[PDB]
Amino acid sequence: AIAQLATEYVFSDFLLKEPTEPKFKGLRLELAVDKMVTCIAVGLPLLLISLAFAQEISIGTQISCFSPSSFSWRQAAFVDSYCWAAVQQKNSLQSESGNLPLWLHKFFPYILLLFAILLYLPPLFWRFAAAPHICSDLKFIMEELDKVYNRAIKAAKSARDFKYPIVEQYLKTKKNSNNLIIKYISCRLLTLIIILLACIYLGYYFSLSSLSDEFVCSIKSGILRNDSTVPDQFQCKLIAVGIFQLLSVINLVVYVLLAPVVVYTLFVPFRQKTDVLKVYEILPTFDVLHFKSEGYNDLSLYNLFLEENISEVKSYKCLKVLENIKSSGQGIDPMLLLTNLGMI
Amino acid sequence: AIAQLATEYVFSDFLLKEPTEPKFKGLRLELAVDKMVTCIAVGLPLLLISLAFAQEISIGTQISCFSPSSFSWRQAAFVDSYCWAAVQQKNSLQSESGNLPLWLHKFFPYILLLFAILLYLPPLFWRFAAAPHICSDLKFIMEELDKVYNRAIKAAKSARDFKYPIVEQYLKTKKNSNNLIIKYISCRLLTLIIILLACIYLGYYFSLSSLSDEFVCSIKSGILRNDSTVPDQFQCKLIAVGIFQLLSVINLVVYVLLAPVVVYTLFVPFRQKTDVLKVYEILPTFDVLHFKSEGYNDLSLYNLFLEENISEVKSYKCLKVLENIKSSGQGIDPMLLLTNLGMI
Amino acid sequence: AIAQLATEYVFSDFLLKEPTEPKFKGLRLELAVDKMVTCIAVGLPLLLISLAFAQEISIGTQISCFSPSSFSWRQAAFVDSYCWAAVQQKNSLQSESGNLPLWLHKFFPYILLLFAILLYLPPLFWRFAAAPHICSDLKFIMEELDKVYNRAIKAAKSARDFKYPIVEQYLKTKKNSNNLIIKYISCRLLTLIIILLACIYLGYYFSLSSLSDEFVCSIKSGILRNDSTVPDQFQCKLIAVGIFQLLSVINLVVYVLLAPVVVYTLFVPFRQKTDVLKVYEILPTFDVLHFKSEGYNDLSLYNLFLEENISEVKSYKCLKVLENIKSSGQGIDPMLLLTNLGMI
Amino acid sequence: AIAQLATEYVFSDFLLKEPTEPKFKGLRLELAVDKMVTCIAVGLPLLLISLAFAQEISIGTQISCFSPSSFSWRQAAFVDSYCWAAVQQKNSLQSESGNLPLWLHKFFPYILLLFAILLYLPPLFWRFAAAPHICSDLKFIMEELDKVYNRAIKAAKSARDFKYPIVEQYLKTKKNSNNLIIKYISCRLLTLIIILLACIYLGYYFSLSSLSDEFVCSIKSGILRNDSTVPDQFQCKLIAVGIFQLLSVINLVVYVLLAPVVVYTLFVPFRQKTDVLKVYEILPTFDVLHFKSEGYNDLSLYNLFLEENISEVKSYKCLKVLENIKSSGQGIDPMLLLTNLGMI
Ligand SMILES: CC(C)CCC[C@@H](C)[C@H]1CC[C@H]2[C@@H]3CC=C4C[C@@H](O)CC[C@]4(C)[C@H]3CC[C@]12C
Ligand SMILES: CC(C)CCC[C@@H](C)[C@H]1CC[C@H]2[C@@H]3CC=C4C[C@@H](O)CC[C@]4(C)[C@H]3CC[C@]12C
Ligand SMILES: CC(C)CCC[C@@H](C)[C@H]1CC[C@H]2[C@@H]3CC=C4C[C@@H](O)CC[C@]4(C)[C@H]3CC[C@]12C
Ligand SMILES: CC(C)CCC[C@@H](C)[C@H]1CC[C@H]2[C@@H]3CC=C4C[C@@H](O)CC[C@]4(C)[C@H]3CC[C@]12C
Ligand SMILES: CC(C)CCC[C@@H](C)[C@H]1CC[C@H]2[C@@H]3CC=C4C[C@@H](O)CC[C@]4(C)[C@H]3CC[C@]12C
Ligand SMILES: CC(C)CCC[C@@H](C)[C@H]1CC[C@H]2[C@@H]3CC=C4C[C@@H](O)CC[C@]4(C)[C@H]3CC[C@]12C
Ligand SMILES: CC(C)CCC[C@@H](C)[C@H]1CC[C@H]2[C@@H]3CC=C4C[C@@H](O)CC[C@]4(C)[C@H]3CC[C@]12C
Ligand SMILES: CC(C)CCC[C@@H](C)[C@H]1CC[C@H]2[C@@H]3CC=C4C[C@@H](O)CC[C@]4(C)[C@H]3CC[C@]12C
Ligand SMILES: *[C@@H]1O[C@H](CO)[C@@H](O)[C@H](O)[C@H]1NC(C)=O
Ligand SMILES: *[C@@H]1O[C@H](CO)[C@@H](O)[C@H](O)[C@H]1NC(C)=O
Ligand SMILES: *[C@@H]1O[C@H](CO)[C@@H](O)[C@H](O)[C@H]1NC(C)=O
Ligand SMILES: *[C@@H]1O[C@H](CO)[C@@H](O)[C@H](O)[C@H]1NC(C)=O
């Protein structure tokens, strides 16, 4: 039913499932905006496919040819099925709009499924190629941040009663390499191109005259070519073509609204803001150097992933509340850190 | 069946599922009134869609055109399907009420699903954008309250046998920022606007003459335009239109009753009452300062979320019972706190 | 099938599911009588809806109009569907009993579902508004009782080898407030009113002549108004109306039997008997004062909830067996308590 | 399918599910004979309902009226559905056996479901009212038996290298109260009465002439009353009536065989034999006094429940093997108990 389809595709965790494995425990591995874009671009065409053939919206068979009254039920069924299979056969049918509109009307669900698959492909390539590496690197970075926070609080407590910036060096090295950012931009660009092509196709499909679904059909090949009792042609109409056009314009609207989001996603350096690591600069055990901005490198992408999935880090949360309290400046950062006692 | 739909949509945890993740363990992340509003506004139109096409209420096909007796079964089926697809084609049909009523009668399930999706969108935006931040902040606040309660009871026990207000400073800082409250008000306002538009549409749909479902249909395009055996027109009726109107007025009543709730929700500062933190003011380790009221800021929203999901805090429950006992004034707050022995 | 519906709605845990959350572990949060009343009042109309359209009891379509023999199958189907949709349209049909009986016959499942939803609403309001508070308070009370029992047995063992009545003070304070009892009485009263209205409706529906299901139908609007081959009217009958009346009288009987139960529930103070706390009065560490009776206050409701869900408390069970043994008076209460050794 | 129904209702744990809660861990809370009686009396009529309308045994529709050849398919369908709905309407039909046989033939599944529900009601009342109390009491009794066994074995080991009969006093007190036994006897008696009424109904249904399923039907009310082309009456037959009678006699046989079991159950004191507590009399720490027999009191019912669900007690099992070995008398009870070393 329509409501069942809605529950499956919008109100359920459709493509929102976290990786089912212990390797990525709590790691999104995909930005929220990218996940939203993929979920829409994939589950919208599927939802429209399901809707267009819902038991309520669908009168019945997808084509009716209006055989003569003399024709029996199965003769008329032969006519309808023959014309359905003959939309491909150009000789059999003669339609003013041509044969491409008939092909599109017959295979619209296939085309929507193709677009959905093509849009799901780049996210899958990301999750299967560049996701494990960033997952491992980000897990190491979070562990290093937790360890340095613990060491700093232990030092503060000892004072009240190595020291090498490994994480900073690793981030600096990431500043050079750009394979991950190149893959990310390539997959986003392919998604954008697929969306644009889908918009072109949907606009063309919705621009039809709405009468191209009606085509003339001739069961006059073979032994029936010179038969007399059979009329030379029939009036066939492809039902649900109006529904297809409505859903196609809906998908076109959604995709044109979505494309600016993908374009904004492509410009990762601009998105790289609100320095996540700036909060850690007040730790004595952490060097006061952010050095993450203004670069078409994997460093900006790692900064984005950190700003996305750093809320799970207790040390980061503690430092963030310390920073927020520092806005008033009533107290002192080391005193607040010592009082917090948030090692684990 | 009707009962199955009821069990799925009203008697089950439809959209009442808690976040399936360890990050939010026991945190609602959504006020009870907001959750009720979203659940109604989403699962009502879906329930009505399912009901309108239930196997019992539905006589059968959604349109019957009453072809002549001479017409065969599949000729009549062609007529019915053609008219179903031709509700869009204005030339084919001539109805007194126009063609918009026919469009609405055909696509009412789609319109209800659209309203449900549009009403579910703002809650989803909230849960995916502003929910993680408030979850982390509120978890930190609850942990700080538990820790300060434990410290105060330990101090009392030591007396019987830092001290910095970090949580108060954090709340004071939240008094300034307003991004969360702005997002909350924006999503509530969008929900209200969607509800009002849905009410307008449902009132218009229910105001129809009830005879607009009957339209005249002409299969007279193409080779059949000059055919003689076919009548110039047919009498088609869209079945289930009365059911659609009944369910639409039901949804209109529900939404007009719900809109005052959304308006009351928009006025969060008025809702900010029954100070949750007032109970903690009797703790020696906690400063006697509430400072949370009369502000279009995130502080009021945080106060609401606390008053919602603070019952899970053992320290808060203990302080609440101490406060309630203090109404008589027979005993002493520190003595009762020491006797309680409710560290964990 | 009928047996499947029975298993789902009477032999299964339909609305008998305990709260699926760790917050309420073993707490009913709903009295047994109230749960029985809600389960009946909700799952009876749903069961009757399912039964009335069971594949065995149902001959087939819900209306047959007996078109002339000259009419084709789909002409007759058009007639039947038109009349089904025209039960609303007063002009189309002319029935002796009127049009309200036809509306009721068509929408009886909707009306039963409406009554079920309206009866499920007050229980849901209770469980979502007043259940968390009573759950927290009752959990605290049980924990306090366990702690005082442990302290008393420890004192007795020490003798053989604070002391403040916090729980008693909390109960005394609950004696004043009445918001929970007011909500309980309001929800019970609304349930009673809904049940009475349902009884009125079912009595009216069952009082019909049983021939109102037969109505005269006229497909004579539009181009067919002046058509000659079509008869001026048809004889239509709404099938399953007898089944609807039978099930409606069954529901009426059940609801009239149930209403006295709801009225008895409304009088909570009378139900407040068999003092649960009287057993704890023999503990040296517990003050000898019950002070819970004869009040339209939340104290009586809390006493009811205690008498309901106190069997899970080992200390209460031990004190109950001590009390029962004290009926003979052969031994001594402190000696029996010491011998029991039931700390945990 | 038939085999699926069999698997669900006889070969599966239909109504044999243990209470899904930690409160009753391993406690039957229902005697084996009572559970068997309830399972049969409930799942037999449901199984017969399912069988009577199985896709294999069922030819098709439940009534066929044999309309004239001139009648079209949907005219005949109208006739059949009209007569199906008119079995209630006495004026419409004229049958030699009357109208009650037709009512019974139409609503036999409803009557079987009613009997199943009425037979399931007393067991449900028991499980929801008197089951928690007996569960708590019996758990306490088993814990006391385990503790006294442990104390006795510890004393024996100490000798080789309070003392109050709390459980005996509790059982003696149970000797007085009779509310549980009264409820048990009342529910068993209601089950017996329901079974007898079901037997009466099934005997009456099976005693029919087998031709009462054939009734004369007249679609001659309304505009068709004076119509000429329609015959004055039709020959309608209610299919599956023979299957209903066969299954009804099967259920009658099962219920008459079952009723003696219920009568034997009612006489609980006679069932109270094979003293379970007699084995514990050899323990030095346990007083040598059974005092459980010859009483219409809850003590006999508790003895039955003990004899039912005491096999789970390791101490009871050890004492039972000691008793069995004592039949030969080769050894000594205290020596065997010391050698067993079965504390836990
Ligand atoms: C997904 C991508 C590939 C879709 C590409 C656009 C498709 C949908 C449409 C839009 C415009 C279309 C073209 C419009 C006009 C003509 C001229 C005609 O004589 C042959 C077909 C041809 C050449 C069409 C082929 C298909 C076409 C290119
Ligand atoms: C992503 C955005 C830009 C998509 C917007 C949809 C645009 C591309 C659509 C809307 C209407 C469409 C046109 C409608 C009709 C025709 C005439 C046909 O003989 C060739 C294709 C052509 C010229 C279409 C090309 C694509 C088109 C211009
Ligand atoms: C969800 C929102 C967009 C719904 C907006 C209201 C819709 C349902 C209805 C209510 C009143 C309607 C209008 C009423 C009157 C007219 C004048 C007519 O000559 C053209 C259509 C037009 C202009 C209608 C368009 C659709 C309309 C605006
Ligand atoms: C949220 C609340 C205010 C909704 C209440 C429903 C209101 C808006 C509905 C109920 C009846 C409706 C009117 C019914 C009939 C017409 C005539 C038509 O030619 C234009 C629209 C118009 C004028 C409708 C406008 C909207 C309307 C006034
Ligand atoms: C659930 C509640 C609202 C149901 C209320 C009772 C319903 C079922 C029935 C019972 C008696 C009925 C009334 C009986 C008589 C008349 C007089 C007639 O000229 C108009 C309808 C009217 C006024 C009926 C309206 C509907 C009615 C009130
Ligand atoms: C909860 C209890 C009291 C419900 C008992 C059912 C009662 C209320 C039912 C049973 C028969 C019913 C009556 C049957 C017939 C008519 C005639 C009609 O023109 C007006 C309604 C009226 C007068 C009904 C009113 C309600 C009624 C009296
Ligand atoms: C479950 C219980 C209520 C069933 C009771 C027995 C039912 C099945 C049957 C068995 C015998 C039957 C009775 C036999 C004879 C007559 C005399 C006739 O002129 C009216 C019906 C009446 C009075 C029957 C009513 C229904 C009846 C009582
Ligand atoms: C539990 C045991 C005793 C049930 C045995 C079934 C008995 C009660 C059945 C079997 C045959 C039945 C009888 C068959 C026929 C008739 C004639 C009818 O006009 C009145 C009922 C009457 C007289 C039935 C009464 C009940 C009956 C005697
Ligand atoms: C049909 O008859 C025509 C007559 O002109 C002939 O040319 C043609 O070959 C025939 N077709 C078949 C399939 O026999
Ligand atoms: C139908 O016949 C008419 C006669 O006036 C002619 O004008 C029209 O073109 C014909 N239509 C078709 C589709 O051949
Ligand atoms: C039907 O014919 C009658 C003849 O009196 C006329 O009044 C009426 O307008 C016609 N109806 C239609 C819909 O053409
Ligand atoms: C049918 O015709 C008879 C002729 O005697 C008449 O008495 C009766 O009222 C008519 N019935 C209807 C429903 O018009």
- CA A318, chain centre distance (Å): 33
- Interface with A, mutate which of B72, B121, B141, B171 (most A CBs under 10 A): B72
Label residue A72 left, alpha or beta by phi (over 0 means left) and psi (-120 to 50 means alpha).
beta
Burial class (CB in 10 A: 0-12, 13-18, 19+), A162: exposed
- Interface with C, mutate which of D23, D75, D120, D228 (most C CBs under 10 A): D75
Contact call for B164 and A339, based on CB within 8 A: yes
Contact D239, D108 (CB under 8 A): no
Q: Which residue of C lies nearest to D166 if distances are taken between CA atoms?
A: C336
Handedness of CA D48, D54, D56, D61 (dihedral sign): positive
Q: What is the resolution of this structure in A?
A: 2.7
Q: Is B25 in the pocket of ligand 10 (CB under 6 A)?
A: no
Give the neighbours of chain A: at least 3 Cβ pairs within 8 Å.
B
Pick the ligand that lies closest to the CA of residue B199: 4
Q: Kindly give, in sequence order, each residue whose CB lies less than 8 Å from that of residue C207, ignoring residues fewer than 6 positions away.
A: none
Polymer length in residues for chain D? 344
- Which tokens is C289 given? 């004062």
Handedness of CA A326, A331, A332, A337 (dihedral sign): negative
Pick the ligand that lies closest to the CA of residue B100: 3
Q: Closest ligand 3 atom to the C-alpha of B198? A: 1
Rounded-to-integer distance, Cα B126 and Cα B180, Å? 9
Closest CA to B78 of C245, C74, A141, D58: C74
Ligand 12: residue of D224, D225, D227, D229 to mutate (most ligand atoms within 8 A of CB) is D225
Q: Which residue of B lies nearest to A75 if distances are taken between CA atoms?
A: B74
Contact call for D50 and C2, based on CB within 8 A: yes
Contact call for B321 and C49, based on CB within 8 A: no
How many CA atoms within 13 Å lie on the side-chain side of B247?
25
- Detail the DSSP E strand segments found in chain C: 63-64, 93-94, 214-217, 234-238
Ligand 5: residue of C114, C204, C244 to mutate (most ligand atoms within 8 A of CB) is C204
Q: Closest ligand 5 atom to the C-alpha of C204? A: 10
DSSP secondary structure of B25-48: SS---S-HHHHHHHHHHHHHHHHH
Contact call for B109 and A18, based on CB within 8 A: no
Chain C residue numbers with beta carbons less than 8 Å from the beta carbon of B331 are 164, 169
Rounded-to-integer distance, Cα B322 and Cα C235, Å? 75
Give residue C195 CA to ligand 5 midpoint distance, Å.
16
How many CA atoms within 13 Å lie on the side-chain side of A149?
24
Q: Is A103 in the pocket of ligand 2 (CB under 6 A)?
A: no
Contact call for D221 and C211, based on CB within 8 A: yes
Residue with tokens 């429940």: D305
Pick the ligand that lies closest to the CA of residue A111: 1
Rounded-to-integer distance, Cα A216 and Cα A222, Å? 18
Q: Is D203 in the pocket of ligand 8 (CB under 6 A)?
A: yes
Q: B71 by DSSP, 3-state: which?
A: coil
Rounded-to-integer distance, Cα C32 and Cα C9, Å? 18
Q: What are phi and psi of D3, to 5 degrees?
A: -65, -40
**Residue B163, number of CB atoms within 10 A of its CB:** 11
Closest CA to C105 of C220, C243, C265: C243
Rounded-to-integer distance, Cα D59 and Cα D242, Å? 13
Closest Cα of chain A to B72: distance in Å?
6
DSSP secondary structure of D269-298: HHH--S-SGGGGGG-TTS-S-----S-SSH
Q: Kindly give, in sequence order, each residue whose CB lies less than 8 Å from that of residue B212, ignoring residues fewer than 6 positions away.
A: B95, B96, B97, B98, B101, B102, B105, B241
Contact C251, C44 (CB under 8 A): yes
Alpha-carbon distances of C243 from C247, D103, D185, rounded to whole Å: 6, 11, 36
Chain A residue numbers with beta carbons less than 8 Å from the beta carbon of B163 are 339
Virtual CA dihedral for B325, B327, B329, B331, nearest 10 degrees?
A: 10
Closest Cα of chain B to C230: distance in Å?
10
Give residue B200 CA to ligand 4 midpoint distance, Å.
6
Give residue B225 CA to ligand 10 midpoint distance, Å.
7
Q: D245 by DSSP, 3-state: which?
A: helix
Q: Closest ligand 2 atom to the C-alpha of A256? A: 1
Closest CA to C160 of C310, C344, C340: C340
- Detail the DSSP E strand segments found in C93-175: 93-94
Rounded-to-integer distance, Cα B20 and Cα D329, Å? 64
Alpha-carbon distances of D147 from A112, D150, D306, rounded to whole Å: 71, 5, 17
The number of C-beta contacts closer than 8 angstroms across A and B is 157
Rounded-to-integer distance, Cα C45 and Cα C58, Å? 18
Rounded-to-integer distance, Cα D249 and Cα D256, Å? 10
Closest CA to D247 of D36, D50, D4: D50
**Residue B178, number of CB atoms within 10 A of its CB:** 18
- Which tokens is C79 given? 């007639």
Give residue B86 CA to ligand 4 midpoint distance, Å.
27
Name the residue at shortest CA distance from atom 5 of ligand 11.
C226
Closest CA to B309 of B135, B191, B165: B135
Contact call for C82 and B64, based on CB within 8 A: yes
Contact call for C170 and B237, based on CB within 8 A: no
Rounded-to-integer distance, Cα C250 and Cα C9, Å? 16
Contact call for C59 and D70, based on CB within 8 A: no
Gap sites in chain B (C to N > 2.5 Å), preceding residue numbers:
161
How many CA atoms within 13 Å lie on the side-chain side of D189?
8
Q: Kindly give, in sequence order, each residue whose CB lies less than 8 Å from that of residue C258, ignoring residues fewer than 6 positions away.
A: C37, C40, C41, C195
DSSP class of A212: T
Closest CA to D17 of D191, D8, D4, C33: D8
* Planar angle of CA A195, B88, B223, nearest 5 degrees: 110
Contact C187, C34 (CB under 8 A): no
Give the neighbours of chain D: at least 3 Cβ pairs within 8 Å.
C
Pick the ligand that lies closest to the CA of residue A108: 1
Helices A100-129 and A179-206: angle between axes, nearest 10 degrees: 160
Contact call for A327 and B136, based on CB within 8 A: no
- Interface with B, mutate which of A16, A37, A245, A321 (most B CBs under 10 A): A321
What's at A133, amino acid-wise? H
Q: Which residue of B lies nearest to C132 if distances are taken between CA atoms?
A: B311
Rounded-to-integer distance, Cα C220 and Cα B235, Å? 10
- Which tokens is B304 given? 């609401």
Method used to determine the 3D structure? cryo-EM
Residue with tokens 């969360």: B180
Q: Which residue of C lies nearest to D45 if distances are taken between CA atoms?
A: C3
Closest CA to C171 of C280, C19, C41: C280
Closest CA to C46 of C246, C262, C247, C256: C247
Q: What are phi and psi of A207, to 5 degrees?
A: -80, -5
Rounded-to-integer distance, Cα C129 and Cα D106, Å? 46
Burial class (CB in 10 A: 0-12, 13-18, 19+), D232: exposed
Rounded-to-integer distance, Cα A238 and Cα A106, Å? 8
Contact A210, B88 (CB under 8 A): yes
Closest CA to D9 of D116, D131, D98: D116
Name the residue at shortest CA distance from atom 18 of ligand 4.
B204
Rounded-to-integer distance, Cα D88 and Cα D96, Å? 15
How many CA atoms within 13 Å lie on the side-chain side of A22?
0
Rounded-to-integer distance, Cα C312 and Cα C211, Å? 57
Rounded-to-integer distance, Cα A102 and Cα A236, Å? 11
Alpha-carbon distances of B222 from A80, A89, B66, rounded to whole Å: 17, 20, 21
What's at A173, amino acid-wise? T
Largest CA distance in chain B: 109
Ligand 9: residue of A219, A221, A224, A226 to mutate (most ligand atoms within 8 A of CB) is A226
* Planar angle of CA B85, B86, B90, nearest 5 degrees: 150
Rounded-to-integer distance, Cα A303 and Cα A296, Å? 12
Chain C residue numbers with beta carbons less than 8 Å from the beta carbon of B76 are 72, 74-75
Contact B119, B194 (CB under 8 A): yes
Q: Is D204 in the pocket of ligand 8 (CB under 6 A)?
A: yes
